[model samples]
Target chain A: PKFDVSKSDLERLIGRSFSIEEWEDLVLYAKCELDDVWEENGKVYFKLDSKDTNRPDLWSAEGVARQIKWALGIEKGLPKYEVKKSNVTVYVDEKLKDIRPYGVYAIVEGLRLDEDSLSQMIQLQEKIALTFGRRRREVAIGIFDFDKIKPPIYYKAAEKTEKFAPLGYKEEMTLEEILEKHEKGREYGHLIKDKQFYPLLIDSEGNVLSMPPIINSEFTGRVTTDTKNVFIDVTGWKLEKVMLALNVMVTALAERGGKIRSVRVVYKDFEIETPDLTPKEFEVELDYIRKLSGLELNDGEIKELLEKMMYEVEISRGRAKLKYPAFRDDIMHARDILEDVLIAYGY
Target chain B: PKFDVSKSDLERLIGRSFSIEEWEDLVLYAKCELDDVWEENGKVYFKLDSKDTNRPDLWSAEGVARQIKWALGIEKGLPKYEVKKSNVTVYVDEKLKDIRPYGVYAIVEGLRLDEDSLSQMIQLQEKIALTFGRRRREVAIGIFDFDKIKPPIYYKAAEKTEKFAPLGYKEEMTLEEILEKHEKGREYGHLIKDKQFYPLLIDSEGNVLSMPPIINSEFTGRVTTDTKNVFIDVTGWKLEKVMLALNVMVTALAERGGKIRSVRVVYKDFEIETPDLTPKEFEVELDYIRKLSGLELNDGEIKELLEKMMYEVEISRGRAKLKYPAFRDDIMHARDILEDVLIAYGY
Candidate 1:
């Protein structure tokens, strides 16, 4: 997999300047090899090659910088993200459970996004959805102007005959008409084409947020350079993946000096708050790391190496307690962590 | 991308009854992972997932078995194929140079195919043409019963009004009619649809063999279980790739104990014999191997490792001369050879 990033933006995130030759060496810590570098209109741009399909987290400049920070010793253990609680809530109608299933969202305030930041956000959203979201079949993300809509938001399945104005259109049309005439609807209509109802998001005033997994409503869903507050929603089949994608988005926004705020999702039988910004802890065996890396190290040495990989580690007896950052949900096993251990042990 | 192979047929080629578990391990050496296995009416069937798109050679069971033989040490350095000289010749019409330009051919005798081998051959032919042949636009392969055709074949381009009976059809039709009515012609018609001329292959008696990169004639292009002798023709835009695909196919047939025979392809001014079975040689430095593998290996160890990977290696004065089999055209660089060296070193 490959993605483009401005060299200046990457250097800013890393808090230092480095030559293209130095970047060739630094990017390997993120499991990326420098593909090419070009200068256009006095701005330097770079293309980086990802070594694995599993790491969607490394698909952007912010994600790559997150890994390089630890390797450069500028940042040590797992970086913490603080999310302030919000009273805003999204009520998921029971009728949607069989259609789209689950959703998670967050509101980021005071984001000062320039052209580069906004373009990077759009790129991150598309890369995550296409790769990790399985071409938006497993997950779909919608970003709206947070100040345009009034809470509480309703997440429900609407009839094909229901009428609303979709993005890029001026006139109101039925859901079926949107699927037939709109570009995005025509492209992604197969995801819910035969369903009796379509997944939709509407605000308190009956303003449509989106006919999601497809296109948003032109009225309330449009976000612009002047927009100070942003609402991000991720709907998908898997709850864990939806939340993980939400975490990745909000954190990228946080890099833009946005203050993260959690949104409460109310389901039929229960309610849960997201994006869950708490770090996840796992119990790993020290012997397992030694065996996987072919490196025999003392407990202190192992702890330091894991920390250098941006993981918080505590040793006890023959086992280590490891904590990963909130945005990273890629660690499914000890072997995944062993990859970081090997990378931290210098490549 | 999916291909079929008889389980018993593959077992016979490998010289062992490898359990499904063993095959699962062996296929990874060929860059393919087992997809599914099932038994229907006492015959076992298998589907393997190809990991890389560049390896069109690994699209069949015969290709897989070739890799397993080297991995198991049953076959050592580059398997030699012997091609007997033949009087059969194909004269190229100068008019085809602007269309599908190059062609190479071979005749294989003593093939005793059953339902399994015949079906597998057809599957391999279609898969290779679709992938490496770029849906037959860049290359196309034709197979026929040798006893059905005369020597001194003529390769030319024909007007759309020329008539012939294509495979799967009973009535004779014009080239334009075949493009409109035949299943294969309709599917691949775009390749030469608007062209002033279409490629045609015929014997000295003016019996049509095939419309190159399109449908073949039912008369001379059909192969059955009793096809003891076979004539193979590959036509394409590029001469090198066409020859490489021909090498892959004839070598696969050689595994069935078929004796390969060469055909002389006479161009506008010159002629060349094909199914060129001579191994290509390359001179590589031992220091290059050490730098690539990151392993300090002595001359003897490096030579032994190359031999294990099915490459003939001769070492002298810190450099090694390497010889690659005709079927193996994937080795284009020193790094490609280093991959084999690492695999043989048990990495």
Candidate 2:
């Protein structure tokens, strides 16, 4: 589904009003397909269509921006990839195996985050993962330091051993202890409990990154305002799953006002690489919805509505990916993506 | 009034069988301004706006053609006056003062009569006299031979002196005898009984032509297959009134299929003259009815309906007029003329 930024003010701590014309213009230029639910007494109700649905975090404004801008014919190309030369890494220990079986890792450097940018970034991760990512049971991504580990990161079978505080908890415990005692762990433990070899991701420095498809290390989980560099990793069901998760996180991270660079990974058997897929253009066909619904629409009016949807998507996600995001899980069809665009487009 | 010709077959005269389409077309095309009556399934009903008042005859098809055609742009130009010429004179013998008064005379030459033409001519006269000439009491016309009548026709009061049977009679009687004995005379005799001198029309040849506004001499009254020319005259309460009657009659006579030629007339000092006034024309505006009726019609539809009305008018009159005839006494106003045209044009 498209991200709906119009409702933000209603939920925002600081309330602001949007004029009808302002709303109309915003929707007219938004990235997603836009439509007003109904109108009465001069006020219009609206909904937005989702853009990219594959990434767990692709449901939020940040994720929407990545796809919407590209849909609107604004940005011109995909984000670029860079190769990281440093031996930044994470390690997998047998003690974490029972609770989580997967982990992944990557690094970000020379990037700045403002309050708004930070919130939008977090929103993307939480929204997409919980909504389209099926509460993170299917996939999970994490970012951490690039200089705190030994070289040659390990990702193999593991058993429960070391203890740590689970996410959303204030106490420390063993991996088994935390899985049963911590609410976040207990609630999300089902994802990896039955796996024979709990997947884990680590940097080349052999430091803990994340319990694949599960929790991250308490020590490195902390994200700071002043952090100049970071690493992202995924540990999940399959290699491709982890790769996709890593792609979404890094692409979204780059959207937080950064000069994104590509990173290269030297796996044991094969070397893999990733790009900073920043949104550069947006282009959406006006008749996409019409074709789906079998509805006849005037060409001019359809174009106008599409333009509005683009604006909505753009406003929701400040910095988006290039026009035409890779078709993703969340956007199983065009209508899902167009709903948010319609809302953004004010009708 | 429009003319409708119906020839009754022997069986039809006993048990009438009529075509509904034909009946509707005739009535619709020739309906009088005063009434719009139609029969459906053997029941007749009048339109809501039917103008049936003042003259009863104006409610039928036989009463609308002359006026309707003028508005339909069929007949054009005005009625011409042919004043008397030469030394024809009539003596108003002062003795026959107790009988009928008033008379009219004019020459209608080379008139050719046919079924359609005679029907139109008779219909025109019937409508004019019945609708506007006050049932021929205030006005009437006579047609005879120019060579058989003397001008300066006398219009003095008279007494029924000579005995001769009146029209449609089987007895020998004087004018007074017929007025007292005949059904028609008894019915209308009061119109001229107290006059000073019975109006009479005679030619320069000292031949009795007609009793003005009333009856014609038996010898010259004969209108036959061989009668190539005619003299027409009207006399009544007012000069204009008499002339109006004369105009209608002569114009109607010209409607008879014939090579009609006008004869000059010099009626003493007041010289009002016109030659070849057989066809009269009148101009009517197209937009007038539209504005009055609040019709939203384009120019093409307007032109089409106008032409249709013209066609119907000519058909109803049963004769073609080079110019619109203007001698219709009921046509004092454009709207009066338009009523029938509207019917012909399907309202």
Candidate 3:
């Protein structure tokens, strides 16, 4: 798969100046290669071919720029994300336990969104939903204007007779009517058509935020250029996946100088705060890295290279303790980290 | 794109026993790594993933086997194809000059096909036609029982009212009815729906062989397990592309030890014989290979590598004269040949 991104946007995300000549050589470390580059409207656009499909983490400008930053030694070790304590809470109704249950919520304030940032945010949401979320069956993300919605929010199931004007539409319509009349509803209606109740998001004030995995309400969900604070809600079938998606979304918004605020998700059986900015730690055998990468480097050298790829590492005995950034869920096993080690080693 | 081939059928085509382990490794060279391998009802089945979509040559068992044979060092240098002379001729009508424009014909004897071979042949025909031929718009290939039809065929356009029993049907119907009623006709109807004259192929005895790019006549086109000799006709918008497809089809059939015979195609403006088995020659600069590969191999070493990849090469002062097999039309540029050289060099 391939995608197009502006050179300036990529540079802004990476916090560095990129020479066009070096892009051809630099992209390989990001698991992508330059397809073509051209100038349009006084901006340079690049088409990059992604070599590894498993790494959906590198699908956006922020993701790719992160890889380039680590590869160029501009930034090293795990990227730090600080989550401030907040009283924002989302109550998940027990009714949704049988429907689309999981909800991960976050608030990012002080965002400086321009046309480019807004478009990139939308593109990232759609890409993650379609590719990683299995076409919104596993997960769906909604970004709303924080000031417009009053919390604590409620995540529950709604009836087919419930009415709300969907995004891009001016007239209000019933849930069933929306499914039949709206383009997006017609396309994604099958996901909830057979269910007795459809997943819905609403604030304490009874204002509809969105119809989960479907269309957002045009009134409260719309985010404009003047919108400074964003309320991101990630709902899905699985808790971990939804949290990972929320982490990716909030971190991407954080690149625009937004302050991260955690939201408490109160479920039927459990309660957790998200997006969880805590880094995940993994114990990888030193010998395994050598075997997987076929590199004869000492523990110190391997740890240094791993740090160069933005992974926090500590060497002890015959194993390396690694900490993965909150935004990434691609590391499933030791071999996954070994790949990062190799890429860090300039393979 | 998908293709099916029996294990025994592939072994027969490659002239060797293909061990399961070797197939796992060998298929990678064909740009279609094995996707899944299973056994059912005493036969082995393989599903492969085509990595390079542009190389439609790897879409069939015979094509994949060709690449494996080269990589395994079982067959070296360009394959030689001998096209024997034949009295069989296809007279193109002047009216078809604007419709289909080009036709390439060939005859193969001693097929000795069984159920597996027959099914594989049909699958290859449809796969190539739909994918490489752009749903039979750019090219269409038809294979018939040679013993069922008369020689000196007529290639022309016919009125939509002309009647014939299309393949798999028991009764006769008009071309228009066939387009509306037959499964294949309905699928490919739009290709020639607007054209006043539909491209047609018939024997001198007025027996319809096929409606090119559409459906074949049941009487002459059917090939059973007992069928021995085969006649193949390829028609398309371009002469070279049509001839290349015919060459691929006939050469694949020839892998079964069938004797390849060429037929004279008498065009309205000129006369020619196909499938032309002459290998194409390319003069590639030796320095170009060195510069592209960054290898310091001498002329002799480079020549040997090229030969191992099934290209006949002659090295001179600073250039190499290369001859590519007729079955391969992928080498359209010097860099393409360079890639083969690198592959042959074990890179």
Candidate 4:
């Protein structure tokens, strides 16, 4: 869920008389998406590990809302993930190498899009990408024709000679040429130039499916208004970083009226264990936020602020985290994912 | 003894943070006139008091100078007045009764006139009369020819029909007439009209000498370069107010290269004290100011700011409290006296 809160409300809740110690603690909590919701008898309730795990929650409204609500008990449960294990595969060719390195894919279908969901997805994507992926340099993703690519997918490195015009560019160019000539190439080329070979995930038919941490080819990167199925991929440094990026991306996509499913990454040399797609369960306790922020908020007020903040935070998280299927490289850290929560909480 | 300190020295002694409690102590000590030396202390420090209480040592330059010298052991002790008792008096008449009510006289004989002394006297008189007396409607003093007046003066109400050349005028005018024609008379006439009989003070001889809180008679008011003896008078409102006015006036005149002595004031049924003056002691604590302002100043620095502040405070107090002498009568509170002190100390 996404949340939105105004700056005025946050300022009112937290006055300027805060000492440096309080400031640091609040900042830390906001960054970590840890919050207090309510207290029972002598026990304080908190929500831990409830926000997007990759981005700074301080800047994410959705992340903060989730954390605050989970802590407050209005929303309590494990992070829910809608899973449809599917055979969606991205094909890679040997020609495009030395540019992008890793790719993770996911297919989400059947969910209906709402205004809030759509906004949240876009917000989370941008937040994750900018804060976590180091502005889309460390990790990047692409969403495209899941119906276009053939199965028996292989994730492998390729040569630099493969020619295709990357997304947002007008002319066709070789992968190496795109790295040098295209806008994304000039903007994000440094991330992959050191590698001797570039990574690309494609099907057996030599069709290009995804390029990790760089621009995707225009052929398979287009999404329709009625598109029922969406694919997500993240390419970059480590598998953990890539997986985290994919997780936030699909989570945001799921919020955007789409059913999420697992996609397989077939590496001839490596074996993958974790599911590529998972639903998000955001649980938080209200007491924790109240205590931590010194908000002294009652149950009703806490819930009201939390719900709005959570929605706004989610939207901010999705947009700021770069959760859009095409911007898979976005989602770098938990904070990047949770900054929306903070924003939603009216920080 | 003279003391001086730099402003930087004072501020440094008073650390960056000061509590309110410390401020009170500082104010008290400064008011007490204990010698404190100050130097450049980064913060602005105005002098409160000095050896010459007539001249305020406010702001860093003046405060530090007084304080630093004191701190350095270069100066010690408070100012002492050598009273030169004399029979100087001003005679009031029935003709001058309604327009000018009270009169006071003092003589300071056998003192060499110097620039410093002259400046100090003028500053004290001008500052005190204007600030304290409300521009001198309630109290006024004239330093005139002690040798000019006839003795056996009588004080009584006038018919507002007497004629004389008031100060700064070329032609003769009646008491009621002067009230409308003369600048001083017109400006201060309102204070006397409401009363049925204007109060007047006269000496042994029946000669119009001084007028209270307004213009003095041009004949006795003439001060020559060779004039050795001076006469002062205060009229209007109450006796204490008049006495305080006389006290400040004499003190300032004493600083002006004149040897000061008491003068007698004769009334209708009784005689009032002449030059009713005393060395007012205000014991301001150093530690109190430090605590109030949260300024952790060392003894040296505290002394410096305090000395300067004390001297200035004295000057400011004199200005505001003594304003009632020169026909000005708006001052009524102790805080009003302290205002100048606070300002002098850079409050």
Query: Which number leads on DockQ?
Result: 1
Question: Which lDDT tens digits does candidate 2 get at residues A1-347?
Answer: 54444334222311244443233334333343343232334333345554445445444445545444544444423334443444433344544445444454566667675554455556556665665556776556565555454455666555566545545666655556656666656787777666554555544544455555567776644566666666666554455565556666665665654434444544444445544233324434545544432234444544445443332222222222214332232344455545544433333
Candidate 2 error regions (>4 Å)? A1-21, A24-58, A66-104, A147-152, A165-172, A195-207, A259-271, A275-347, B1-347
For residues B198-252, what per-residue lDDT tens digits would candidate 1 score against the true structure? 8888887878989988889987757899889999999988888888889888988
Tens-digit lDDT track of model 4 for B1-347: 23333233334433233343443345333333434533343433334443333233222222333333343334433334577556544344434433444555567666444433333344444444554344565345555556665554555565566556676666767677776777776676665644455444334544455445557766553556555666655554335555666665555454444677775565455555466555444433344344445557554554444344323122332121122122112223332333433443463
The complex in candidate 1 yields a DockQ of 0.03
Query: Tens digit of lDDT per residue, candidate 4, span A35-69?
Result: 22223343222332224443433333344444444
Cα error, candidate 2, residue A301 (Å): 15
Better of 2 and 4 by lDDT: 4
Cα lDDT, model 3, residue B343: 66
- Interface CA RMSD, all predictions: 13.1, 36.1, 15.8, 29.3
> For residues B115-167, could you state the per-residue lDDT of candidate 2 as single tens digits?
43444445545555555555565456555555444455554444457444344
Task: Calculate candidate 2's fnat.
Answer: 0.00
TM-score of candidate 2 chain A against the true chain A: 0.61
Local distance difference test values of all predictions, in order: 0.83, 0.47, 0.81, 0.49
What would the TM-scores of all predictions be? 0.57, 0.36, 0.57, 0.36
Candidate 2 CA-lDDT value: 0.47
- The better candidate by DockQ, 1 or 4, is 1
The C-alpha stretches of model 3 lying farther than 4 A from their native spots are: A1-347
